[PDB]
Design an enzyme around this catalytic site. Sequence first.
Site, PDB file in Angstrom:
ATOM      1  CD  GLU A  35      -3.131  -0.686   0.143  1.00  0.00           C
ATOM      2  OE1 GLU A  35      -3.129   0.437  -0.412  1.00  0.00           O
ATOM      3  OE2 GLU A  35      -3.981  -1.558  -0.115  1.00  0.00           O
ATOM      4  CG  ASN A  46      -8.902   6.962  -4.016  1.00  0.00           C
ATOM      5  OD1 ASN A  46      -7.939   6.264  -4.315  1.00  0.00           O
ATOM      6  ND2 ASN A  46      -9.317   7.116  -2.765  1.00  0.00           N
ATOM      7  CG  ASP A  48     -14.073   8.673  -4.930  1.00  0.00           C
ATOM      8  OD1 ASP A  48     -12.938   9.110  -4.673  1.00  0.00           O
ATOM      9  OD2 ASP A  48     -14.667   7.876  -4.182  1.00  0.00           O
ATOM     10  CB  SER A  50     -11.919   9.848  -1.594  1.00  0.00           C
ATOM     11  OG  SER A  50     -11.716   8.714  -2.421  1.00  0.00           O
ATOM     12  CG  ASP A  52      -6.612   5.641  -0.713  1.00  0.00           C
ATOM     13  OD1 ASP A  52      -7.769   5.912  -0.359  1.00  0.00           O
ATOM     14  OD2 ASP A  52      -6.380   4.793  -1.596  1.00  0.00           O
ATOM     15  CG  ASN A  59     -10.960   6.184   0.403  1.00  0.00           C
ATOM     16  OD1 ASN A  59     -11.037   7.400   0.329  1.00  0.00           O
ATOM     17  ND2 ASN A  59     -11.351   5.378  -0.581  1.00  0.00           N
ATOM     18  CG  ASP A 101     -15.931  -2.841   7.398  1.00  0.00           C
ATOM     19  OD1 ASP A 101     -15.691  -3.983   6.957  1.00  0.00           O
ATOM     20  OD2 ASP A 101     -15.739  -1.803   6.727  1.00  0.00           O
TER      21      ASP A 101
END
Length: 129
Positions: A35, A46, A48, A50, A52, A59, A101
């Site tokens: 990562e 990203n 959209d 957003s 990281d 994110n 989650d």
Amino acid sequence: KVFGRCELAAAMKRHGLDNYRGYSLGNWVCAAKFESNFNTQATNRNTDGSTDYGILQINSRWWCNDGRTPGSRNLCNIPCSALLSSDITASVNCAKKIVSDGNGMNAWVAWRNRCKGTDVQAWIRGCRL
Ligand SMILES: [Cl-]
Ligand SMILES: [Cl-]
Ligand SMILES: [Cl-]
Ligand SMILES: [Cl-]
Ligand SMILES: [Cl-]
Ligand code: NA
């Protein structure tokens, strides 16, 4: 801060990630390698809008606030800049929420594509833990 492999393994173990939700330590070291290349200051944008952040590339669409991701959530209740610190505590605590989650470590695309199903124990081989 750019961690060494065994240095990061030891820090993640001290913070309770070894076998957290059933994921052995090597999974977490492998995810961080691919990562961020073990760099706490890594950022990537990203499509959209957003971003990281940090050693585990968390994110802003869901997990932290950076003031520039409209309509997003802040489920770890932190500014995203806190995930860039040389102290990995904030990243680890937020990662614990993520992995709990329902989807496990599949949330980390690099884990799913480069670590899942491999011999992840090799990532902690030779380390004093
Ligand atoms: Cl390495
Ligand atoms: Cl392991
Ligand atoms: Cl925002
Ligand atoms: Cl620490
Ligand atoms: Cl799981
Ligand atoms: Na956000």
